[PDB]
């Protein structure tokens, strides 16, 4: 997989963000994860976590997997990086997202995400508390 440039337009919630990609505004949904909705427990903390990561980043990148690049709602499906650190994995590591929506052929980082989830669960963090 390859990292490509993008710039932040605006934070949305724990697992969606509006980015400019190839010069066009798009909503991105983060692959392999599910954060709580803002109305749910840990939703606001997940939103804040993603917001801080993407707003503080000097460089945002997106990486598409091998399969579908947009979902049925027109959202981009990607792994997002802030100053080289994967947002998707970082949310799971912090117990702010569950590994979820693992579809075959867009699952390159599944192992990495599951290992983060195991560690978060062992530490009893947030969702796992
Ligand atoms: C993350 C992801 C979500 N989706 C779709 C499945 C779910 O459909 P439904 O809306 O029919 O439940 C939805 C969940 O996204 P959200 O968690 O943002 O609600 O997005 C994909 O199709 N591919 C993906 O990789
Ligand atoms: Ca969600």
∠ CA 92-95-96, nearest 5°, is 80
Q: Whole-angstrom Cα distance, residue 125 to residue 117?
A: 10
Give the dihedral sign, CA 21/28/114/109.
Answer: negative
102 contacts 110 by C-beta, under 8 angstroms: yes
Q: Is 123 a catalytic residue?
A: no
The answer to whether the CB of 98 is under 6 A from ligand 1 is no
> Residue 11 in contact with residue 19, Cβ under 8 Å?
no
30 within 8 A of 62, measured Cβ to Cβ: no
**What is the resolution in angstroms?**
1.5
Helices (H), 11-109: 43-56, 87-93
- Give whole-number Cα distances, 13 to 79, 81, 105, 107, in Å: 15, 16, 25, 22
Segments forming the whole domain that contains residue 28: 1-129
The token pair at 11 is: 């934070």
Residue from 65, 66, 78, 67 nearest 27 by CA: 78
| Long-range contacts from 55-60, C-beta under 8 angstroms, 24+ separation | 55/8, 55/11, 56/82, 56/83, 57/8, 57/82, 57/83, 58/83, 59/5, 59/83, 59/84, 60/5, 60/6, 60/7, 60/8, 60/19
- Please count the structural domains in the chain: 1
CB 59 within 8 A of CB 107: no
3-state secondary structure 51-76: HHHHHHCCCEEEECCCCCCECCCCCE
What is the number of the ligand 1 atom nearest to the C-alpha of 72? 22
Spatial distance between the Cα atoms of 63 and 122, rounded to a whole number of angstroms: 29
Nearest ligand, measured from the Cα of 69 = 1
Identify how the structure was determined: X-ray
- CATH code, 19: 2.40.50.90
Q: Specify which residues 78 forms β-bridges with.
A: 30
Report how far Cα 69 is from the mean position of its chain's Cα atoms.
14
Site to probe by mutation for ligand 1, drawn from 15, 29, 67 as the one with most ligand atoms within 8 Å of Cβ, is: 29
The DSSP bridge pattern shows strands 3-11 and 33-34 to be unpaired
């Amino acid at each position: 997989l390859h990292k490509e440039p993008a710039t932040l337009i605006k934070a949305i919630d724990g697992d969606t963000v509006k980015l400019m990609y190839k010069g066009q505004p798009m909503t991105f949904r983060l692959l392999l994860v599910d954060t709580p909705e803002f109305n749910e427990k840990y939703g606001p903390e997940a939103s804040a976590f993603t917001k801080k990561m993407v707003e503080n980043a000097k460089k945002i990148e997106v990486e598409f997997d091998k399969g579908q690049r947009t979902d049925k709602y027109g959202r981009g499906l990607a792994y997002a990086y802030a100053d080289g650190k994967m947002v998707n994995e970082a949310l799971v590591r912090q117990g702010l997202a569950k590994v979820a929506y693992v579809y075959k052929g867009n699952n390159t980082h599944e192992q990495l995400a599951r290992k983060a989830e195991a560690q978060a669960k062992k530490e009893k963090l947030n969702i796992w508390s």
